[PDB]
Structure of L-alpha-glycerophosphate oxidase:
Amino acid sequence: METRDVLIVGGGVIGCATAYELSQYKLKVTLVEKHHYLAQETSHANSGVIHTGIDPNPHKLTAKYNILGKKLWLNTYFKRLGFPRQKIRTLIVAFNEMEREQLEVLKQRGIANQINLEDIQMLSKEETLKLEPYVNPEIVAGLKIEGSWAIDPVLASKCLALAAQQNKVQICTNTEVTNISKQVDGTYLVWTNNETTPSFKVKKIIDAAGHYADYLAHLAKADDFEQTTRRGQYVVVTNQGELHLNSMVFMVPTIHGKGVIVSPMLDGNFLVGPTALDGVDKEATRYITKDAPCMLTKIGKHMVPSLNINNALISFAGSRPIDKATNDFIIRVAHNDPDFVILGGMKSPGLTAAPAIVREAVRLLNWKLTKKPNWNGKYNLPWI
Ligand SMILES: Cc1cc2nc3c(=O)[nH]c(=O)nc-3n(C[C@H](O)[C@H](O)[C@H](O)COP(=O)(O)OP(=O)(O)OC[C@H]3O[C@@H](n4cnc5c(N)ncnc54)[C@H](O)[C@@H]3O)c2cc1C
Ligand code: NI
């Protein structure tokens, strides 16, 4: 049985960035992940986009943490951590007059979420097709936003963890939390992999368990929020000849769901998707099906008609964990246990928001913390 200050449960990007942030303090920290490797779940199956903030409702935590999160990635995390990424602008395209006025709404949203005017540009049909000659010519309008990036979220999550690990954070994989009990004395005992006796005794739990973030709070008797799901399947295609894109192209999200794209990927291939299906089981959140490819053909070709979807390399899927009550991020202490911090409902744009989400996690522990004087935070993930 390890006694420790903080147990972080879940090794997606939220758990990993949390470990990184806490590694700068004098603390005994452990992170637990049920899989043999980190970032195998939602943080594996997403489009990797660092969103501008044009999209999320400005009154929600999604917008708030998008804004903070992105600044942190660009002006702090990218200076210290090496992993693949690239700067690439956002283009949202409209197909009729109703989608066209949605662009005007989106513009306003971006401004409300503090995007400078110089980054936003409404484009006519003609201007859009000049910028991106391979887009559907039946579009009527476009909205271009500079400032977005695309990263490999897997390599980023691992970089964060390795960085944390280098600064004395304990990372335990193949370790699934199966029971938690708060003690008379204020600490938790934690059982893993259904073992008989506890593996950990800790003062604080940071719940970053993705689709099981709700399960884990119910298990600690700490909060009773519930998540639902939205599963999205993608395809990656290659060998598209003369095809080029210098933007990530999006359908209007307001009409077609969040993050429906055709994007050029870091590896030179094109990502298409995703589909959308609500209410799949938690254990099914990454299952691919034979239904989805057909929807994917319609989505890709509507946006980039010269796309050949038979030139397909992989199919994969992921699901957004969605808080049932608020349809927003959950970033707070449990309502019924001030020592259990919840980072749940980590839907889009949780990746973009991550750094801000986890700094708030650190504050919600409500401790006077002492910095290690010899921390700088730098890690270059070797990759080629
Ligand atoms: C299709 C799709 C597209 C998206 N696109 C973007 C995008 O372009 N940009 C953006 O900003 N956001 C995007 N998002 C949102 C983003 O991917 C998620 O916000 C983020 O990955 C959530 O990370 P997480 O760490 O909370 O969850 P996860 O990555 O799911 O990790 C949670 C971890 O907890 C572990 N776990 C669960 N239960 C236990 C247990 N009891 N014990 C131990 N471990 C446990 C799991 O194994 C796991 O890996 C997208 C999401 C989806 C689904
Ligand atoms: Ni407002």
User: Anything to note?
Assistant: Residues 58-59, 112 surround nickel (II) ion (ligand 2) (CB under 6 Å). The chain has nine helices and 22 strands. The CA atoms of residues 92 and 252 lie 6 Å apart. The two ends are 39 Å apart (CA to CA).
